[PDB]
Amino acid sequence: LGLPTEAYISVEEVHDDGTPTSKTFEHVTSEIGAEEAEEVGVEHLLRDIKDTTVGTLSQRITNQV
């Protein structure tokens, strides 16, 4: 599910409701970078780049998670 990296940024502020200190890490959106000739080491063994498995197993994964 989701992605391996979790992004947190720690900031100091006054909570509007009034939590004391209000200093904590804040979650931020995270993404995967773009590289070339990187999965030749790994994906070459497997891979499934086709529309054949769309709606065959893709629906199962979404229902699964």
Binding site: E12, E13, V14, D17, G18, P20, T56, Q59, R60, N63
Partner: protein, 373 residues
């Protein structure tokens, strides 16, 4: 100076002993004992103006001590104003000393907070309100002192004094709760401040958040000392909506403020009732008869045909409304907070439906296991 502290400075009981100790600190050069213990004796208010007059002499001693201004100067100024009494030009002198000697920039922002408060006492919504804006710039984004933010809250509360803007009061009181160290605030003094917060402070149209501030624990416990029925009436306007019995009670709870804004508040509860149907009830019970809205707007059922349109007009939340029975069944709504313990969020609505989905997901797997491969 050493002779002055030994005998003339003494006023309250134990003052000769503490001043003799202060002389030992002066010789020992222990600024920290002078910064905390000596200022702690100054903190005691029994001496009142007399300690403050002595404090001007002690301020010269403090200049030799060179104790950190954010701690030492602010405490000296807190009792310096008591010595000043009515400061027609005394305020300029204390501000001048604070400006001339600054251990840190943070102390300079503390000087600004004092300047604004003194200006507020002599003048209203003039340079002092602009100085309150200047203090926001001076504070910048640093809440580490926390007490400095409370001083910033004090001018923000002073801005509420300068212009009624009860919404500004609602923001400052919330800011005070965040920047207060804890419940270390004198409970009785805060309960007395909460008595005002329970009365004029929450009676002001500025705060009505269905318990976002009202159900916050520290203020409500202090507001318990304030009439409980008035405190209940404040919750009642937000979630009880029309609360006609509470409407009679609100006049009893606080005649000031409520009487002045009774028509405006009546309009606000009518808007609150319209928001209440959609967030509290999603579908089904969200749809309701025009007569219930007539009771909700405390208006006649024939009048509610006209009235629902006015409540709909505010359009605080975008939705779909059918006038067949004035049923809501609307779209987007923003609840200030969820009711109870978010019982709807548990198996009452959410979670239970999610459990049902995975069993159906298993049915998709059973339907086509070979295809999954």
């Amino acid at each position: 100076v050493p002779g002055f502290l030994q005998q003339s400075q003494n006023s309250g009981p134990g003052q000769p002993a503490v001043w003799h100790r202060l002389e030992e600190l002066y010789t020992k050069k222990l600024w920290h004992q002078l910064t905390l213990q000596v200022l702690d004796f100054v903190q005691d208010p029994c001496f009142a103006q007399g300690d403050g007059l002595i404090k001007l002499y002690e301020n010269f001693i403090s200049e030799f001590e060179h104790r950190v201004n954010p701690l030492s100067l602010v405490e000296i100024i807190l009792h310096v104003v008591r010595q000043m009494t009515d400061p027609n030009v005394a305020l300029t002198f204390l501000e001048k000393t604070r400006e001339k000697v600054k251990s840190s920039d943070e102390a300079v922002i503390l000087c600004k907070t004092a300047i604004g408060a003194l200006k507020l006492n002599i003048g209203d919504l003039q340079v002092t309100k602009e100085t309150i804006e200047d203090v926001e710039e001076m504070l910048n984004n640093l809440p580490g002192v926390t007490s400095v933010h409370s001083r910033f809250y004090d001018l923000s509360s002073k801005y509420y004094q300068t212009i009624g803007n009860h919404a500004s009061y609602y923001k400052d009181a919330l800011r005070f709760l965040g920047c207060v160290d804890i419940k270390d605030l004198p409970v009785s003094e805060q309960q007395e401040r909460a008595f005002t917060l329970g009365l004029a402070g929450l009676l002001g149209e500025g705060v009505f958040n269905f318990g976002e501030l009202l159900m916050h624990p520290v203020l409500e416990s202090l507001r318990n000392t304030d009439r409980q029925w008035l405190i209940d009436t404040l919750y009642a306007f937000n979630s009880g909506n029309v609360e006609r019995f509470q409407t009679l009670k609100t006049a009893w709870g606080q005649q000031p403020d409520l009487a002045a804004n009774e028509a405006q508040l009546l309009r606000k509860i009518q808007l609150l009732c319209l928001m209440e149907m959609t967030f509290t009830r999603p579908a089904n019970h969200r749809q309701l008869t025009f007569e219930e809205i007539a009771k909700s707007a405390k208006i006649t059922v024939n009048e509610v045909e006209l009235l629902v349109m006015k409540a709909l007009s505010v359009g605080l939340v975008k939705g779909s409304i059918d006038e067949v029975d004035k049923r809501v069944h609307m779209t987007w709504v923003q609840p200030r907070v969820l009711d109870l313990q978010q019982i709807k969020g548990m198996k009452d609505r959410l979670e239970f439906w999610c459990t049902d989905v995975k069993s159906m997901e298993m049915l998709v797997e059973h339907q086509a296991h070979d295809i999954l491969t």
